[PDB]
Amino acid sequence: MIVFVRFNSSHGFPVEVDSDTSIFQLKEVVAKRQGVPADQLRVIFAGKELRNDWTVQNCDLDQQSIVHI
Amino acid sequence: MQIFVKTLTGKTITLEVEPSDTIENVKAKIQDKEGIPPDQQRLIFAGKQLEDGRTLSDYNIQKESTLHLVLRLRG
Amino acid sequence: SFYVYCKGPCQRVQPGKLRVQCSTCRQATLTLTQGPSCWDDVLIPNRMSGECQSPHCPGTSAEFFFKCGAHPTSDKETSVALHLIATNSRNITCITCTDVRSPVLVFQCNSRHVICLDCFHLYCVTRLNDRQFVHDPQLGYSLPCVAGCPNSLIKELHHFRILGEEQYNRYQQYGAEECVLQMGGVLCPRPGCGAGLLPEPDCRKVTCGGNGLGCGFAFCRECKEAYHEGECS
Ligand SMILES: [Zn+2]
Ligand SMILES: [Zn+2]
Ligand SMILES: [Zn+2]
Ligand SMILES: [Zn+2]
Ligand SMILES: [Zn+2]
Ligand SMILES: [Zn+2]
């Protein structure tokens, strides 16, 4: 499935993930695109910060919803 | 966003607004377009008179929705 | 589940999603201190709080918004919440047709009466055309509980979106007309006009054409014919 990321209010970019995909995995893949440390990144969805250990399934992220990394 | 203001005759004016624009703010832009003094303007949505202090968001007025305009006459 | 009116592409009542942005920078970067417990928490502005995690913004106040859940939607593709509408999980029968359907609308009368959307559509299309909607200077053009329960006027008038587009626009037209009349105003009697006018109550002479908004007709508000001196007829 796809999740849209708004890195520091930048235009949303699609990221392909799985149900089993963790938040840190997404933090890594975004960190690579932006060439920054994944440790400085925080993922915000539905007025909550998503923790690294949580998966996409656990977060109840719907197809093509948006997070604010 | 785009909203519409219509008189009861059906005459239609288009405005570029934000949900945060006050009812007072909406009343202005109308003066810019049609030259109606704001004091003569009364705006209505779903049969409710809109109060100057309030915003479009206060009335949950959506993009492409219509406000109705009627005129106060001093005579 | 919550329900919204999606104006496009669904053009119908759909299940919705609740989301939240910072009230100052209008970005979904605000983390809530606590989750909402009631409708008022999400409906009344600035009611709940948190921290906008965008550094340049000292965001405090939370702004809740709603989206259609039937398809992908952008951050700013918002829909109006129809807070009276609920999933009929407990299979409550419609107060009008007695059948079980989902979703349903729940009136805010003491008895919290339940109506299906087909019957609500019906209730609405019947009352509008018969000029049986009620004007409340506080609420607007609305309808009460179909059972006639007191203090049951619908407060969120976007619920009348169930009328459908054309009938909705007629509803708004009729409501504005009624607003004028309840304020002691007059509708211009000239054919093709019908402009809403609010003269001073003392004035008998009402002139409708300065900025192009009027037809210029000067009329007597009592007989609705061209302005005349003395008594009508
Ligand atoms: Zn939709
Ligand atoms: Zn902010
Ligand atoms: Zn029914
Ligand atoms: Zn009732
Ligand atoms: Zn006229
Ligand atoms: Zn007369």
Numbering used by the authors:
A (entry chain C): 1 to 69
B (entry chain B): 1 to 75
C (entry chain A): 145 to 352, 354 to 378
Quote the study's own text.
Parkin is an auto-inhibited ubiquitin E3 ligase activated by dual phosphorylation of its ubiquitin-like (Ubl) domain and ubiquitin by the PINK1 kinase. Parkin is an autoinhibited RBR family E3 ubiquitin ligase consisting of an N-terminal ubiquitin-like (Ubl) domain followed by four Zn2+ binding domains RING0, RING1, in-between-RING (IBR), and RING2. Like other RBR-family E3 ligases, Parkin binds to an E2, and ubiquitin is transferred from E2 onto the catalytic C431 residue (on RING2) of Parkin before ubiquitination of lysines on target substrates. Furthermore, C431 on RING2 is occluded by the RING0 domain of Parkin, which inhibits Parkin activity.
Phospho-Parkin K211N (3C) formed a stable complex with untethered R0RBR Q347C (TEV), and RING2 (383-465) was removed from R0RBR Q347C (TEV). The fractions containing the complex of phospho-Parkin K211N and R0RB (141-382) upon treatment with 3C protease followed by incubation with pUb-3Br showed co-elution of components of the ternary trans-complex (R0RB (141-382), pUbl-linker (1-140), and pUb) on SEC. The crystal structure of the ternary trans-complex of phospho-Parkin (pUbl-linker (1-140)+R0RB (141-382)+pUb) was solved at 1.92 Å, which further confirmed trans-complex formation between Parkin molecules. In the crystal structure, the pUbl domain from the donor molecule (phospho-Parkin K211N (3C)) was bound to the basic patch of RING0 on the acceptor molecule (untethered R0RBR (TEV)) in trans. The conformation observed in the trans-complex was similar to the phospho-Parkin (1-382) structure with fused pUbl domain and untethered/truncated RING2 in a cis molecule. Interestingly, the linker connecting pUbl and RING0 remained disordered in all the structures. The ternary trans-complex of phospho-Parkin (1–140+141-382 + pUb) structure in this study was solved at a similar resolution and in the same space group as the previously solved structure of phospho-Parkin (1-382) in complex with pUb. However, we did not see any density of the ACT region in the ternary trans-complex structure of phospho-Parkin (1–140+141-382 + pUb). Interestingly, we observed that in the ternary trans-complex structure of phospho-Parkin, K48 of the pUbl domain occupied the same pocket that R104 of the ACT region occupied in the structure of phospho-Parkin-pUb complex.
